Symmetry: C5
Subunit: 362 residues, 5 copies
């Protein structure tokens, strides 16, 4: 047990086998659920005090809710005794996800008054996946009508575009946001025996043709269909996220690029005990850009079963954040980045997006 760590990497990877979350993961669930009014998963309502206290920028809240929801789905898998709870939290996640505080930047930016009609795939992709994960966990048909509507919007929009996928802001295409949307199609198919996921092959072909540097195993920052532009910089956090979720749809894809990605962005240090991730090429700096390179790589390492890298990244990320457990509840005194406890939570419990996809009934 490394100094400033709460549990061993072995303990995290063993949770499914044990059918029990680690104590610190339980304490994170306590943070998420325990205290009236200010815990993030206290209420269905449009109250965002937990995110206010964390100083989460408005635009980041949707992702915060999304990654919490994904971690919750894995908890449901790990411990049957917490599955009812995880499902309750997922219900709340979907409710909050639909509040105007969360999706409102779309309207404020001038893009329209409806966040799902088109193009907000950074938002509606996550929402569609959450609809799905909720139903897999709980078997409830509470959101089935909305799930169907949103899934058709997504499929149709994919089908109509000359490129494979959907944009975020108009004329902005992000490979990582698309992989949420496609993953959500796989989940809808599992629930209903449909074949929306058929679109995935063209998408995987497309992103491999111009959006990736195959040699370095890294995706370019973004693509912009009307100009044809592919932004010249490769992005680690973008690649880590995308490979993690693609791994749940096409494992050979991610297994192909994963060791090249590591070669390109990952800096092991401190005699092998720790690792840092560079955000782009031509630099020595770790976690530039949005600062999420190391955290998303922590999730990718978990998805790929790479326990050594996971242990290395966590040894870098968690200790300076200064974790403590007070009254059986987890706090970080110095969160190192945006989405910090969210991504650390997700990575600690992540069962694989492939496993989430094929979740047992009840």
């Amino acid at each position: 047990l490394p100094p400033g760590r709460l549990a061993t990497t072995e303990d995290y990877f063993a949770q499914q086998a044990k059918q029990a979350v680690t104590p610190d993961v339980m304490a994170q669930l306590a943070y998420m659920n325990y205290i009236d009014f200010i815990s993030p998963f206290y209420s269905r309502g449009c109250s965002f005090e937990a995110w206010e206290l964390k100083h989460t920028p408005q635009r980041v809240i949707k992702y915060s809710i999304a990654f919490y929801a994904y971690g919750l789905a894995s908890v449901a898998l790990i411990d049957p005794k917490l599955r009812a709870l995880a499902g309750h939290d997922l219900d709340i996640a979907v409710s909050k996800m639909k509040c105007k505080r969360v999706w409102g930047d779309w309207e404020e930016d001038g893009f329209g008054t409806d966040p799902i009609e088109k193009e907000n795939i950074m938002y509606k992709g996550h929402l569609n996946l959450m609809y799905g994960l909720y139903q897999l966990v709980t078997g409830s048909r509470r959101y089935e009508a909305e799930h169907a509507h949103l899934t058709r919007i997504i499929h149709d929009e994919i089908a109509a575009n000359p490129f494979a996928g959907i944009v975020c802001e108009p004329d902005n295409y992000f490979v990582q946001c698309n992989s949420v949307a496609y993953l959500s199609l796989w989940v809808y198919d599992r629930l209903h025996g449909t074949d929306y996921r058929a679109a995935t092959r063209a998408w995987l072909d497309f992103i491999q043709k111009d959006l990736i540097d195959p040699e370095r195993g890294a995706f370019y920052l973004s693509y912009h269909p009307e100009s044809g532009a592919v932004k010249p910089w490769i992005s680690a956090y973008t690649t880590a996220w995308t490979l993690a979720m693609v791994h749940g749809m096409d494992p050979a894809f991610s297994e192909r690029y994963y060791p090249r990605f590591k070669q390109t962005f990952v800096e092991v240090y401190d005699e092998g005990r720790k690792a840092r991730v560079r955000e782009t090429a031509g630099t020595d700096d770790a976690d530039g850009g949005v600062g999420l390179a190391s955290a998303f790589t922590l999730l990718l390492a978990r998805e790929m079963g790479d326990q050594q890298l996971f242990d290395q990244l966590l040894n870098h990320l968690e200790p300076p954040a200064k974790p403590s457990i007070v009254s059986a509840s987890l706090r970080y005194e110095h969160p190192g980045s945006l989405l910090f406890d969210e991504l650390l939570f997700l990575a600690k419990v992540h069962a694989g997006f492939g496993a989430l996809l094929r979740m047992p009934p009840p």
Copy 2:
């Protein structure tokens, strides 16, 4: 004596026998009533400067008023010469309780424009108990029509639910919020010879199934009837509050669990002189969560006639709060928690909820 205590425990428990409140209680009543414009009970108006000066969060104001009200009800029982004053203050309590500042979080959260028509038992439970306590204290029929209306709302909603009781926010069930509502049914019955309280039996049975840990004498945090989830943490403040209220309706219920509760949560320290209460299991930390576990156990100790625990808790709670009496009015320089002077006032004077329920007329 101890140091920073204002009166002995024997003195607080003797108030009803002596038909006189202690001087620190009178000094608390002065804080509540004395200074123009800024004392809590200055006018029926929708002005909350007293609460602004205390930095009371908006969501907590409804509870502050309610617990002031319950304490004033006992004051009425203790000293006949103060019963008119207590009744006046209860009249102001009810009026302020109905101000949008107090219940407006229900509408801001997106739950509805009307705070009593469905759910929201956290608010309308207290309001209905207050309607009844005002009438018991004063004999006045000023709110009788509103009282009948809300009592029937609560009665109908109980009858209509598959689970025993009523939710607060949609799909959030709390045992302590329900105990207020049921107790309000008993008060209505006492005033009108009705039998709304018959529903209590089913409620007491229900909360003793999945909502309690019978051996530890501790309730779980909450229940969520849509998903069936019971949140896996036991909660001291929740249990102390619930047992205190239930003791006025089914004393054997509370008498049965009270010693186990103490075993579970209460830490005696300083060679028997003091006591502090853990909020949940699996920690050594006292007063986590909302931080009210000791303050509510103080009220419970009073309700159960446990003078030893009362004394121990007050020695923990009151001295670090640095009480002073300036111009015959009580102030605490460092309130240790939310609802601090409200809960200490209430505990000091509390005659027992059964006694309040059987209050003789004016």
Copy 3:
């Protein structure tokens, strides 16, 4: 002899009316009130309150601040005939500002209604009514005559229709000091018009001497609450000082009776007789608790009762720590000790007695 931080002697203040001249520091207070464009409190009839913002007056207190200036001004007019025109001008501005929504708006914000004079709210409309009258008394102007008569009718009818003697402030809140202002306003109206609205005063003085006063301690209780019959069980010095002072203008024997009991209950002489402090309530040693105005209003009461020794003692307590200075012939205080500080010190230095204001010569 002039105490160490004082601006003028007590003898000088009590002599002003005799010499027909305000003291220099009273004149400098009037400069503060009138001199500097835009920010002086009596600069214009407009609904600007920058003077009060610069003083950090809380909103609910502005009406009282305006009212107590007005009462001081009425005495300046009685003291110095050359300043009577000025005094009347400031009273004109006081009435105008009194009617601005910034001043009475708390009534609507507390949910009590959109019209501040229609019913109740005697804490506001009592003062307004007295000010209407003092204005016409001082100036002879009939500018506010129509609304003066209208409000006097409101107050008269409200008193007639209430089971208890008087009128509430907030609904179900009855305050003896606020009522004293309203009744006095009826005396002023009668002085102006020869009428007999003041006839209700007898029943009121009988009422408040029942459950509202502790006759032995010469002190009023905090408040009365008619729907429950409650009388708050604390006696209040500022309440009593203010009430006795204004009642002395209508029934001087009432205040003669309770004044020495009041002093025994509340007043603490200290510093070898040189100073005095006023305790706000019973059962405490602490001075000026509660609203913090006990000493300030007793200062007014001492003036009204001609008690120069007590006046001198309180002013020695109140004025020096506040550090008065005169800059460019205008008075400032560096550390005002309480709300309404320069208002009440001004009023007490010029106060001619409410009875004498009633007998003010015509023009």
Copy 4:
């Protein structure tokens, strides 16, 4: 050349004879005109960044613009090569003067939504005078209709009032504000051959009646028609401003009171090297009240051709304000008062209000 001074007094008084402004006056025109967006005369639009930067209070902006305008009118008279610039700036001045940022205090105070209809001579007096000076300087008829409209309003209001002149705020009469309005009438007559200025004799008679203290040669602060009150304090800045403008209409008037004014208010110090001005009587403090006594006396000294007092006042005002010229543009590090660079500019170029009236016609 004293330290902290930019040019000699001789240099300022010689500008007109030499047909050129001094270099510091040019540097001041640069501050006024040079920098995109933030210079005060950059744009005709309703932008007030320059005044925000100087922390000009909203109520004072109208006087700032106006005093700039009066100085620009003298620049036109001093230097024919700057007359086009001067006129362009005066165009902008009139245009900004009409923005709601500038006159809106009239509506906020609750005095009405139209700032020229009645009263408010503090605002529309300067506006009318500016309309006039703009047209004297440029010959442009851009504002003729508005100018004629306002001039009739002002004329009809004077004709209708019992007192000679027009109030500012309701029931507030100020002589200095009236002096601008009357001067604006002289300018209108000079442009149009009319005789609106005929009302000046009645006005000069009236202000000499109860508004002035003959011995001290000083006006009282203000007059209030309703109560008849005349505020009992004399004001230096009020007198300086008024005597300067009246000197343009009736020089014997200002000549009669000027030496009296100086004995009352002006303190020469530093062995005759400096002077400063007291704001009211019975104080030794200089520049109390609004703090403009010295700055306006500087203008008065110029108007009266009193080079010695001008030099003394400027030695008092300019050095501690730390003038520097950076990139050919004037800045003061520590302006000692409101309207500081406006009033120093105006005093440094002022050709006399009488000379402004007799301006040679436009091409």
Copy 5:
């Protein structure tokens, strides 16, 4: 390589031959493009977080956007592999340029609700050049309709005025703002084969006879048609900007005045290694007024092929601003003026306004 410099002047002037931008220019494009939400060219929405982080005053945003855009047009000409990206960024520039946050000052100042209808050539001149440069780079007709509408407005307004050109604020005439407008006509003619540029000769004759001091090679500050007033100060930033753009339309004109301009305003110092520019005559102070003399003279030196002055100016401007490259992205610790990174960016890549006019079709 001088101390504090990122690249040699040789390197900047060689970019077009190498068909590659220097690494620091690429790091500037990263600042403009890389980080989600906060980079200035992230999306075409009406969000200006980038400029809020820079504390760009509102009135200055439009020139920021315009000078970025001109910079991007030269990137497109320099590096074919970056032309698609340059096109995408220009699309975003035009989009944000039309946002009310950018032109709104026109309405707030009381000048009207329509920012292009009449006057305001300071805004719509830049907009019109940007329309054309966008279409030159991309070939897209996305804005062609509004380009034609605005070009006609400018054309009709020039034809209707007694003086040659168009005012900014009513009655305010600026030679630099007019120069942008005339250049925009040349760009429109290149795209459509029209002859709008014919009005240029009358403009050049007029500004040369009336608004320039031929001896000093310097334009006066501004002209005011109604009063006939010409502000009596000459302005370096005004002149540097105007000669730079005129050089794209009439190279002989600017060549005539350029050596005189430098004589008047440019101070060489530090043994010929640095230079700084006085904003006006009769002073020794450099960069007074708007503080842009040196930065615009840097652009002008680039336009005129003057590598010596370019190097001297850049040695003055860049080192005290303390450039650094973090995570392959350029940041200045201490920008010495408004529009700082925009104008250094533009000067470093600027291929000449004449070269832009002759841009190959893609």
